[PDB]
Ligand binder design. Structure first.
Ligand SMILES: [Mg+2]
Lengths: 176, 176
């Protein structure tokens, strides 16, 4: 259920947001958009639990808010090359497509795993630089990597071959 | 060497530019920014061939042009999610960090290979959709993927553990 998705946010994203704001202002701002995107994703999982799978045309419309937060995540990073936190900004900007697992079938889990590999290329740099030197950096990496690992496990149990829609539900081309 | 780098460009990038412009205007526009970045990368190779390795502060300034065109490649893709060629846009935007091999040590080749895996995640989608249907899409993929594979081979041969500087050269910040 959606509570299991929120449990992942509570466990990993919560502390991650705080560490992000503590590390640097532009990392905090980029992660605020990731959090807004994650909230939108939770809402789409809930809508899908209540609705018949929509047409491809309708699906392309439902994903728009997510893609717009992804544009901003990428813009903040690409415009901050001269940040002392560029590897942190990259870990997120180069793996924000994990959000698109909701329109991937039959491999939403592998879609997230691909994006975790891209995040890790940068977070491995952060650990090499900061292990034993800045515990906030180390814990920031742990929270994001664990979030992606646990998101893949959530997908594998609850949306194994694709986001779970409801064949007896209402029309997705709706909202509230 | 500068001439061998240009040879990669002639073999793979030049026909790729023609295919891009032919496929869609936004793909042609994104690829023209990629070419400007490759032109800047060739010039840095030339600079390094004739200059002593500069300070870390100076290296950060020398790569700004490259990074500026990379930001634009990303911007065009992120702004065109309505493109009927989004996988083509993503193959480039998600791998444009291959350009940064010029500041990576001792693993510039693995750096490009990591970016090639990100490009292939998207080009494999293009091939699955278009092999047997649109030879221009197939050839577009082949040229980009072969440019990255040949670039990794070029790095292995001429800049194995890092871009080659000249310890008996001039100042990188200026020429003759
Ligand atoms: Mg990007």
């Amino acid at each position: 259920s959606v509570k299991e998705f929120q449990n992942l946010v509570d466990q990993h994203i919560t502390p991650f947001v705080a560490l992000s704001k503590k590390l640097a202002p532009e990392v905090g701002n980029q992660v605020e958009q990731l959090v807004k995107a994650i909230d939108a994703e939770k809402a789409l999982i809930n809508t899908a639990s209540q609705s018949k799978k929509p047409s491809q045309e309708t699906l392309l419309e439902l994903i728009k808010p997510l893609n717009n937060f992804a544009a901003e995540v990428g813009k903040i990073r690409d415009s901050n090359r001269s940040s002392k936190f560029f590897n942190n900004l990259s870990a997120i900007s180069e793996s924000i497509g994990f959000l698109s697992w909701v329109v991937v079938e039959p491999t939403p889990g592998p879609h997230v795993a691909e994006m975790r590999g891209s995040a890790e290329f940068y977070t491995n740099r952060i650990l090499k630089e900061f292990k034993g030197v800045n515990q906030d950096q180390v814990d920031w990496v742990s929270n994001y990597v664990n979030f992606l690992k646990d998101l893949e496990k959530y997908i594998k149990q609850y949306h194994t071959t694709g986001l779970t829609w409801n064949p007896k539900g209402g029309d997705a081309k709706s909202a509230t």
